[PDB]
Amino acid sequence: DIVLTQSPASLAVSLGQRATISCKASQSVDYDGDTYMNWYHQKPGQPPKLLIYAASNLDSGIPARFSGSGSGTDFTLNIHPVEEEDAATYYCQQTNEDPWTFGGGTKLEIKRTVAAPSVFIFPPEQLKSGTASVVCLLNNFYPREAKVQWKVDNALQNSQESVTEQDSKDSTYSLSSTLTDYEKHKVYACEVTHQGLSSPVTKSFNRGEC
Amino acid sequence: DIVLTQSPASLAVSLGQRATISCKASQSVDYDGDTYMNWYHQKPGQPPKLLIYAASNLDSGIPARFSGSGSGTDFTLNIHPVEEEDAATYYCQQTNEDPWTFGGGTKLEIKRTVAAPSVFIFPPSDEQLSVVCLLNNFYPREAKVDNALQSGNSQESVTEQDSKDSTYSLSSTLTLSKKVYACEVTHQGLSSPVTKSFNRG
Amino acid sequence: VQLQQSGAELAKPGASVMLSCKASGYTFNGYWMHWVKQRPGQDLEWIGYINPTTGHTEYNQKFKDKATLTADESSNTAYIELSSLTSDDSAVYYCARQEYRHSWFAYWGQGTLVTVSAASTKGPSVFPLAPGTAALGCLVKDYFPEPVTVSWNSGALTSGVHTFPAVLQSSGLYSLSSVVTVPYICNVNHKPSNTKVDKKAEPK
Amino acid sequence: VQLQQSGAELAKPGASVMLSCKASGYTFNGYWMHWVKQRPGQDLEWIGYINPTTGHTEYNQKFKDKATLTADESSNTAYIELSSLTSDDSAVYYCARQEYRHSWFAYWGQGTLVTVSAASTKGPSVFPLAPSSTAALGCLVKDYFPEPVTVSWNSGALTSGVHTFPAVLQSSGLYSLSSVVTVPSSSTQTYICNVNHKPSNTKVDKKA
Amino acid sequence: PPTVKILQSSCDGGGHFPPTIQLLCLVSGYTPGTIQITWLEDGQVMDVDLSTASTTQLASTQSELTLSQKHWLSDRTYTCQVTYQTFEDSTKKCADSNPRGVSAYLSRPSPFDLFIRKSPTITCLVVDLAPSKGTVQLTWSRASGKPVNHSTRKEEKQRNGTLTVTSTLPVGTRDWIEGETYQCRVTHPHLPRALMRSTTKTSGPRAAPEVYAFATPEWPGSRDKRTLACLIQNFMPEDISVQWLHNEVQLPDARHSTTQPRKTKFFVFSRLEVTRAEWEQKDEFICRAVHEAASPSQTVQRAVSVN
Amino acid sequence: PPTVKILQSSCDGGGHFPPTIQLLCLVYTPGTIQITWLEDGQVMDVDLSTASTTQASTQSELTLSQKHWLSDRTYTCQVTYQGHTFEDSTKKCADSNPRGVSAYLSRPSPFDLFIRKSPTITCLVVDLAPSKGTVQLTWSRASGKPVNHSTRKEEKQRNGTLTVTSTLPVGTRDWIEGETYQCRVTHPHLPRALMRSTTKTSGPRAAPEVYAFATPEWPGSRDKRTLACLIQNFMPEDISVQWLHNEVQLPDARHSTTQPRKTKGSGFFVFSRLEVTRAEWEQKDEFICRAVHEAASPSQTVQRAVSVN
Ligand SMILES: *[C@@H]1O[C@H](CO)[C@@H](O[C@@H]2O[C@H](CO)[C@@H](O[C@@H]3O[C@H](CO[C@H]4O[C@H](CO)[C@@H](O)[C@H](O[C@H]5O[C@H](CO)[C@@H](O)[C@H](O)[C@@H]5O)[C@@H]4O)[C@@H](O)[C@H](O[C@H]4O[C@H](CO)[C@@H](O)[C@H](O)[C@@H]4O[C@H]4O[C@H](CO)[C@@H](O)[C@H](O)[C@@H]4O)[C@@H]3O)[C@H](O)[C@H]2NC(C)=O)[C@H](O)[C@H]1NC(C)=O
Ligand SMILES: *[C@@H]1O[C@H](CO)[C@@H](O[C@@H]2O[C@H](CO)[C@@H](O[C@@H]3O[C@H](CO[C@H]4O[C@H](CO)[C@@H](O)[C@H](O)[C@@H]4O)[C@@H](O)[C@H](O[C@H]4O[C@H](CO)[C@@H](O)[C@H](O)[C@@H]4O[C@H]4O[C@H](CO)[C@@H](O)[C@H](O)[C@@H]4O)[C@@H]3O)[C@H](O)[C@H]2NC(C)=O)[C@H](O)[C@H]1NC(C)=O
């Protein structure tokens, strides 16, 4: 068994510079003048896609920014210049000796400008289900770091959050929070503090108001 | 300049027997682990055709009686069983290095049951005013062609061993520039010599 | 030129399942079919390969007791069976194909989400999200097993749609939500439960 | 995949002759075409080859001054020009062809017989043979130069049982060839031999 | 007198084959009358459910044969048969202009398996074969036709995306030495022409090998391990088996690196490296050579020591 | 709206081609229409085609020579119908398993760069057909500076293949500076050009080691003895070996040396064999096995002597 190792595990590159990732193996994947190392990358939910094969050859329909180099046990991939749709997880692969094996993987975050999240709130019609839930959405914000706190009667208290992947077009993340005794309290609010906000913003609503 | 020396230069094999020809070389005809030795045979009037290449490979459309073996400096060609159509001269060739060179040749003769010639005397044509004594389809080639036993007033000509009858034929031209003409013939298959005679008219 | 995998699966611990992979077109020189296991958030593992033209098999030593490959060239379909399933065996299974004179995967499969659980299938409940540009969304909570997918009007509203990854609720069921910004109808599909629910985005 | 060469030729000592060898068809990958000399009843001697695509050549040490290979790619034709013709040059000349990825010869030509002498080009003399009584009739080709002569029976209608004897040199320095053919005793039909002498461009035919 | 000509579908702008190849047979310029159109695949009749015909009137007629990519590329022969009161035109898959082709090798038994182990085997090998063409059969036959034992067949996927089929045939101990020749027949449907290869015991002189063992001096920094070398030269012919023995037992091939026989002006070099604990147990290593011309029992060896 | 598709000539029953290749282009609302052929983009002589129109049905047949059809040229049927253009293309059907071209570019031998100080590189092309003998390869330097004059020669091999070898001299200072040279190969049969680059070896460099031996006297060779030499543990693989007797160098054809191969640990290794005569050792019982290497010290030369008695 050959063991491959990539470095780093994650990095953030801005638009206009070159990204660089290396991958080292337990054996020389060279053989009789040929080198058997490839470069894949996959976006969330999708199967991987080949970018560079044989350590220095480009596949069909791949931009000229992606290039590789190396031999023996050291290999290197470059992305110059980086575009907005390059955020993915990149893998190296060896195909010289069974069993075939892959590298660890290197996640790519796109460094862009600051963006404050647009805040919307949604109350539970669905109240007939026997239990209520409050969802607060933060759409198209950067970076991923953001805080959300729930105010029940203007007081903090059973919440789970999810974050979408970095978008390929907007290059921004999005966050959701599900706040699941409901009728016993009056006012609900979603407190969000973000680096793009000069002042902390909060959206509020009263139950059955209209 | 690799030279090839094949032996023997002439041999006779019975019909259905086994023919063996050796081809010796001055240098290894092998290179890169492979043998560059070929085998051809030449019919009269025609160019040679390839019988076996790389010593141990038969060409497309060659009978299964031909088999070649050997490498390095000594090679061998085997024919079994021999048929009447194999009457030709065999040459071995090397393609190992320039210049390509052939052997001395081996003439294979197909032995068979002895046959007597059909003798005929032809008086000369009146358009010239040249006797012709024909012996057709006999075997073997050992033959002896005014009641005057002469010598030096006639010429000879012989055909090749036929490819389907395996027999020879001979032509004799007794010349007479401007009354009794005849031709005597003695052969091994015949019991006693026979004569064909013709008129002065 | 592309490949087509089977649908999502749900299996009990210790049983066996069958997964497929369909190849398009025709290649007269042949091909090799490989299987690659991956848990969401883990490195890629090579299970093995099988030559559909001859049926020959070679397995990773760590998968010889768990995986056995099968293929039928009459329909360009590749199969794989997993025995003695545990919680560590649940993952997503890609099928990749190696072409002739190639040493790289040229075509990948869509991926088959397999979950090993003793619990039965549970259907989702879809609730809308009622609120210059505003937003509208839909909430699909409490479903099992993964995954369940959602869309907006079957291509009517594509841009501005954000559907977050599934969040495992503490009860044992999953939960997800989709939104859309407009300055619409939600199409929620859950194949393991054989339930397709539609929901419109309008205030109420 | 056939090779046809020039016909018979005659040359004076010290002159030059060029022999052609054209290949039928278009072969994509290319091919080397050699030339092989065969003296009267002696060994097969190798001369050299030429790649018509580029014109590169390699000659033998013996024929380096006697032969010159030329070729044109467009017409699939090769040429060999022999200078300083001598009696040693009176021989049969074949053009063999080696194909791509072959350690041997694949196609051979019919051969171009070259006779180097000072004798005059002479037409043949055809005299029939009288059948007197399996019947037999023949034809006599006398006093022709140079060799060879093309003989055909019934313009190619009768080919079985025919014997065309090799030429023999007469005392006056001229050639003589004979041909016979055997037919059933009834014989009903006609038997005519057609003779062609390529060097002198003469063609005759006589009846039995 | 009808004229028969066949056209076919043109390939893609990048040379690709379409999903379906279409053979259009054109029979034009015949006196109007009764006429029949039949398609023939490799000599046998194809059913008319894959063909459509169109007739107009001189007189000309066209029929379009619809084949799949697996059909036309199967290297088969198709003939448009027109029976007019028999005229025909044939076509097959356009062959490669520079085809790589197949190569096959058939080696001879090792002198170790022939003399010491006394279980000699020959092996037939085909390399550079596609995924398909992977059931290519390798059947055995002898020059005399005498029975052969069962043969093994194994296939191995290579690094360059190729496949190699291997077939090993055991031979009788006395039968191989007298001079029998064994044949290997390679055939597959895609492969048009059968490939044939044979082997036999070498027919040349016989000369015993000269064995010489030596040890490399103590190189700076190389005290925990030592390099041993063995030179074997002037043996005929090139069939030889080189082994290394330590503590009166043989070592695997992976421990040493041995060259291939090259012709002498044959000689081989082998290189075995030992560890510190290797010579401490038994400070003696035997470079054993198995050759047909050796004596007493087709084996000649020499020892070597580290100190 | 017109419709356009092309049909070509079918191959012989044995998969062979006709002498020529004919391509028929079949073309809707009647009006203005005209057909044009394009050879890899360039327009062709309209005299090469013969058009036909039936009212509508319009077609045009273009006859190609097998040389150009097999040269992998792309041909386009350009049809302008009552306004705008519509195009269909076609090239020769690709081979199933082709052989392709094979090219090699070698590094200068250390004896030329270090001992003689006049290195040379070479662009080698192996295994191709005779008609691809006119394949002209063109040198080029990555720095943009012009290249010196090179040598070209074609060679007829045993296996009936051709080999065109092109040697290029280089400047000593330029090579060590880390230059990259490229060989560009062109031929009408290949629509695209093949290129390959080589440069100096950069990486860990280790010094070679020499061990010489003289075989004992064997009973059957009274007047001959074999000399061996083992070189090992050197990086990288670029090296050159020579034998010396009586202060002169023996030709390369005098000793049978092998190609480098990696050791079980660090370095490569090479064996060498030398057959000298009895008169060779009686004149001077001394034989040197020298080697030129990058990391060889001091002057890139290391050798040892050996005697037979
Ligand atoms: C894609 O990759 C694959 C990798 O699998 C390549 O496949 C290889 O292709 C090569 C050549 O195409 C094959 O080599 C042939 O092997 C024949 C059998 O040899 C085997 O047995 C010997 C024991 O005798 C083993 O030691 C060998 O393996 C080991 O040894 C070699 C050193 O030799 C090491 O380098 C290896 O790493 C191994 O450790 C083999 O397994 C062999 O007979 C044959 O040799 C003929 O040709 C050479 C010149 O090339 C001659 O010198 C030689 O003499 C042979 O020629 C005739 O003469 C002998 C007389 O003894 C006859 O016996 C022969 O039959 C022959 O008629 C050749 O070397 C290799 O086997 C094969 N690999 C496998 C696994 O099958 C593909 O080529 C590659 N594709 C491309 C496009 O490159
Ligand atoms: C018909 O027969 C002919 C010969 O009769 C045959 O041509 C030969 O083909 C082979 C294979 O294509 C050629 O071998 C190559 O030769 C080059 C050049 O080597 C020179 O230099 C060495 C050492 O200096 C000398 O020993 C040699 O004699 C030459 O002078 C080699 O460089 C090639 O080696 C490559 O492959 C090896 C094994 O795979 C590797 O170990 C080696 O490192 C080389 O690897 C490649 O990649 C490296 C990666 O960086 C790169 O740096 C290297 O430069 C290299 O590109 C190879 O051995 C041989 O030269 C040909 N001979 C002639 C006279 O043309 C035909 O192939 C044959 N046809 C058929 C169909 O079989």
Residue numbers in the entry:
A (entry chain L): 1 to 124, 127 to 159, 162 to 184, 189 to 218
B (entry chain M): 1 to 129, 135 to 150, 155 to 187, 194 to 216
C (entry chain H): 2 to 132, 140 to 191, 200 to 220
D (entry chain I): 2 to 134, 141 to 194, 197 to 217
E (entry chain A): 231 to 253, 253A, 254 to 286, 290 to 317, 320 to 499, 503 to 544
F (entry chain B): 231 to 253, 253A, 254 to 256, 259 to 286, 291 to 544
Question: Could you share sentences copied from the article?
Answer:
The interactions between immunoglobulin E (IgE) and its two receptors, FcεRI and CD23 (FcεRII), play pivotal roles in allergic disease. The open and closed Cε3 domain conformations involved in FcεRIα and CD23 interactions, respectively, preclude simultaneous engagement of both receptors by IgE-Fc; binding of FcεRIα and CD23 are thus regulated in an allosteric manner. We thus reveal the structural basis by which IgE-Fc binding to its two principal receptors can be selectively modulated, offering insights into an alternative therapeutic approach to the treatment of allergic disease.
IgE-Fc adopts a fully extended conformation, exposing both faces of the Fcε3-4 region, to which the 8D6 Fabs bind. Approximately two-thirds of the 1150 Å2 interface with IgE-Fc is contributed by the 8D6 heavy chain, which contacts the Cε2 and Cε3 domains from one IgE-Fc chain, and the Cε2-Cε3 domain linker from the other IgE-Fc chain. The Fab light chain additionally, and exclusively, contacts the high-mannose oligosaccharide moiety covalently attached to Asn394 from the other Cε3 domain.
